[PDB]
Each structure stands twice: as C-alpha cells, then as structure tokens.
Amino acid sequence: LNGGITDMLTELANFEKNVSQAIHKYNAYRKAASVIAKYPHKIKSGAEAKKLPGVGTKIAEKIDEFLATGKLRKLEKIRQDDTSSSINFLTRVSGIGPSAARKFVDEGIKTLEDLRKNEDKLNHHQRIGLKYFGDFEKRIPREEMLQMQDIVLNEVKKVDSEYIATVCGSFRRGAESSGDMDVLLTHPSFTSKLLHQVVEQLQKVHFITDTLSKGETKFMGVCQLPSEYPHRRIDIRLIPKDQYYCGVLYFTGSDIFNKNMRAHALEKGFTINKYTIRPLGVTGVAGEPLPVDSEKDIFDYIQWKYREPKDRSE
DNA sequence: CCGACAGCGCATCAGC
DNA sequence: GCTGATGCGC
DNA sequence: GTCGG
Ligand SMILES: [Cl-]
Ligand code: NA
Ligand code: NA
C-alpha cells in the first residue's frame, strides 16, 4: 500500500536522529510513518495524507514528490553521502550515539573494521555493542523468550523465594517475537544488594554473559541460552513493592495503550505514571500515591475493566 | 509566533 | 578528590 | 516537523 512512503519517512527519521541530531524531527517522521502505516488505503496525494494527524505541509510535499517521481532527491543525495551514511551506520552499534558516531567519522573511523582496529577509543558499552553487533539486531522468537523466562524465574526464586519477577514488554502481551528481555524485579523488603544477588546468580549459571551497566536499581546486559544461540539484550529493574504493579503496567505497554490509559485516568480525575497513581484536587494539586497491590487495582481506581496484556495493543 | 514533544539510571566527561 | 553536565539507551 | 496554546 504505502510501504514506499513509510520507508522514506523512516529513512528521513534516522538521518534526523543520527546525523542532524534533531530528536524531535526524528519523532515527527516516525509518528507520520506510523499513522500512514495504519492507513487502510493506498495514498494518492500529499493532500490526502495531510488529513492524517502527524502529517503536515512538509511531509505532504515530500509524498507528492515521491508519488510523481518514485524517489526523493534529498534522500538520494544523503544515501550517496559518505559522511552521512557512515555516521548513520555507526549508530547501529549499541553505545554509539550521534555524538560518538560523528567524532569517529571525523577521525576517519567509518566502519566496523575501523572500530575493530581502534578498540582503545571505545568505552566498555561500545566494545560490547561491537562484539555482538549482528546478534543485537536479531529478533528473538517467543519460544526462546519462554526458555529465557524459565531460566530467569528459576534462578530468581533460587536466590530468594520471596522475590517477584515479571518479564514485561511485548512478550507479556503475547508477541511472537521480541527485541530484548525486560525483567521487573521486586521484594517485600524493598519499598519507597537485592539486585546484585540476582545478577550474580544469573552469571553463576552462565546465563548473563556481559554487563553494559549495573547499579542498585537497574542492570543492563547480555545473556545467552545454553547450547549456538545468539547473545541477547536483557534489562533487569529493581522496583519498590508499592510501585511494582504501576511499573509492570507501564513496561508491558503498549505505548498507545499507556497513552489511552493516562487520558482516561485524567478524565476520571487521576494521574498515572510508571511509578504511582495519584488523585487530583479541585485545582490540580496531586495528592499522596494510592495503594496498589495488582494491575487490576489501577483499573478499578479509574473505573476501567481489567484488560489482559494480550488486548493491550491499543 | 513559538514551546512541547518523557524522564531517568548509569557511565563518563567537564570543571572546580 | 568532588559535583554537575552530557551521552546513551530505553 | 507537527501540533496547539
Ligand atoms: Cl510520583
Ligand atoms: Na495533518
Ligand atoms: Na547506537
């Protein structure tokens, strides 16, 4: 239908983010690509697309050029540009953002090979990103995610049977594949070394293989199923018990669902973030956080019917 | 016209 | 050494 | 880049 248009917008988005360092223009192009990707008709003109929310005058003009010529002069030039294409590519390395990519390209470091012969110029995260470059770009089939969940739930309970661990993200919504694994962790003793002991055990059984970052509340690293399976990205967050289910709700998503749930909350007189759900006074003064002991409690606070994660796509 | 567009944990830099 | 800023990812 | 105050 409009794959040519959405690919064009996505490509424009990446270059704004990675090369121009214009994050808001990146998101504008992404939003336009998303709304067009859902549009159930083949677009015949920029004017037609303009009617959609997120598509404005500039994108309408670009669509008109694309429909009449089959390309975008601006994009064609960008693709051919050595500096811009190299910067854009380097950002595919985890740990390499627009700033590092620009600095690397400035000094003639443009390829994965260039990165390999300049390890001294890479920080720990970037070296890991380089090491697992191909693996990190692979999807994870649900069956592997289940096997990964089996290991995590098993080892967590082995450390302390009172831990509560939930694998969230699109996986919890029943997705057939995932980009990574996002684990939410809590314990009755923690409210508003618990994380360390879990990471340590996962390393002990050789599930966790590398560490990108690690503090008292957040771990970001690499894992791998026993055999060879690709190495996978895994995050683990330690959340206070009284904020756990607000966290589970938020990190389960989806993004559109969270947006819809916050809107309904306000219309019912509540504000919902990833941490707490709080009532609003007659002027807008937010009160103390409300007690939450399940996902359903959040729904019951705003007079909503409990939606299964499976149905939380929108 | 012009400000918002999410906010925060961790690693590391910049400055004192 | 320290504090605050920045880069990065999510 | 787009939206909306
Ligand atoms: Cl709060
Ligand atoms: Na529009
Ligand atoms: Na990157």
PDB file of N, CA, C and O (backbone and C1' of nucleotides) in Angstrom, chain A residues 95 97 99-100 233, chain C residues 6-10:
ATOM      1  N   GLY A  95      25.634   1.816  22.223  1.00  0.00           N
ATOM      2  CA  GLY A  95      26.619   2.612  22.928  1.00  0.00           C
ATOM      3  C   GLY A  95      27.178   3.725  22.060  1.00  0.00           C
ATOM      4  O   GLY A  95      27.744   4.695  22.566  1.00  0.00           O
ATOM      5  N   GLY A  97      26.109   6.685  19.937  1.00  0.00           N
ATOM      6  CA  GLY A  97      25.032   7.588  19.574  1.00  0.00           C
ATOM      7  C   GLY A  97      25.519   8.574  18.529  1.00  0.00           C
ATOM      8  O   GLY A  97      26.622   8.423  18.007  1.00  0.00           O
ATOM      9  N   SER A  99      26.643  11.571  18.749  1.00  0.00           N
ATOM     10  CA  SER A  99      27.857  12.291  19.128  1.00  0.00           C
ATOM     11  C   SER A  99      29.125  11.469  18.896  1.00  0.00           C
ATOM     12  O   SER A  99      30.078  11.950  18.283  1.00  0.00           O
ATOM     13  N   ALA A 100      29.138  10.235  19.388  1.00  0.00           N
ATOM     14  CA  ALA A 100      30.287   9.353  19.196  1.00  0.00           C
ATOM     15  C   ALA A 100      30.467   9.010  17.721  1.00  0.00           C
ATOM     16  O   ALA A 100      31.591   8.969  17.221  1.00  0.00           O
ATOM     17  N   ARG A 233      19.976  -9.019  24.445  1.00  0.00           N
ATOM     18  CA  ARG A 233      19.932  -7.919  25.393  1.00  0.00           C
ATOM     19  C   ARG A 233      18.907  -8.205  26.485  1.00  0.00           C
ATOM     20  O   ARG A 233      17.766  -8.583  26.200  1.00  0.00           O
TER      21      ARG A 233
ATOM     22  P    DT C   6      25.152  20.320  29.520  1.00  0.00           P
ATOM     23  O5'  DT C   6      25.626  18.907  28.943  1.00  0.00           O
ATOM     24  C5'  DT C   6      27.001  18.680  28.683  1.00  0.00           C
ATOM     25  C4'  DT C   6      27.185  17.234  28.280  1.00  0.00           C
ATOM     26  C3'  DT C   6      26.242  16.768  27.180  1.00  0.00           C
ATOM     27  O3'  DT C   6      27.067  16.302  26.125  1.00  0.00           O
ATOM     28  C1'  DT C   6      26.343  15.177  28.918  1.00  0.00           C
ATOM     29  P    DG C   7      26.435  15.937  24.695  1.00  0.00           P
ATOM     30  O5'  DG C   7      26.393  14.345  24.713  1.00  0.00           O
ATOM     31  C5'  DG C   7      27.612  13.641  24.882  1.00  0.00           C
ATOM     32  C4'  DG C   7      27.313  12.164  25.008  1.00  0.00           C
ATOM     33  C3'  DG C   7      26.322  11.615  23.987  1.00  0.00           C
ATOM     34  O3'  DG C   7      26.964  10.505  23.371  1.00  0.00           O
ATOM     35  C1'  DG C   7      25.703  10.962  26.190  1.00  0.00           C
ATOM     36  P    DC C   8      26.288   9.746  22.127  1.00  0.00           P
ATOM     37  O5'  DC C   8      25.380   8.643  22.825  1.00  0.00           O
ATOM     38  C5'  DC C   8      26.001   7.636  23.612  1.00  0.00           C
ATOM     39  C4'  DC C   8      24.941   6.828  24.333  1.00  0.00           C
ATOM     40  C3'  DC C   8      23.736   6.442  23.486  1.00  0.00           C
ATOM     41  O3'  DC C   8      23.960   5.132  22.972  1.00  0.00           O
ATOM     42  C1'  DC C   8      23.190   6.929  25.794  1.00  0.00           C
ATOM     43  P    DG C   9      22.855   4.407  22.055  1.00  0.00           P
ATOM     44  O5'  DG C   9      21.872   3.727  23.110  1.00  0.00           O
ATOM     45  C5'  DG C   9      22.375   2.811  24.070  1.00  0.00           C
ATOM     46  C4'  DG C   9      21.262   2.511  25.048  1.00  0.00           C
ATOM     47  C3'  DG C   9      19.984   2.027  24.376  1.00  0.00           C
ATOM     48  O3'  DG C   9      19.664   0.754  24.892  1.00  0.00           O
ATOM     49  C1'  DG C   9      19.520   3.789  25.929  1.00  0.00           C
ATOM     50  P    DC C  10      18.552  -0.159  24.184  1.00  0.00           P
ATOM     51  O5'  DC C  10      17.197   0.258  24.920  1.00  0.00           O
ATOM     52  C5'  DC C  10      17.076  -0.035  26.309  1.00  0.00           C
ATOM     53  C4'  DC C  10      15.933   0.735  26.939  1.00  0.00           C
ATOM     54  C3'  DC C  10      14.596   0.576  26.221  1.00  0.00           C
ATOM     55  O3'  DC C  10      13.682  -0.161  27.028  1.00  0.00           O
ATOM     56  C1'  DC C  10      15.012   2.831  26.896  1.00  0.00           C
TER      57       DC C  10
END
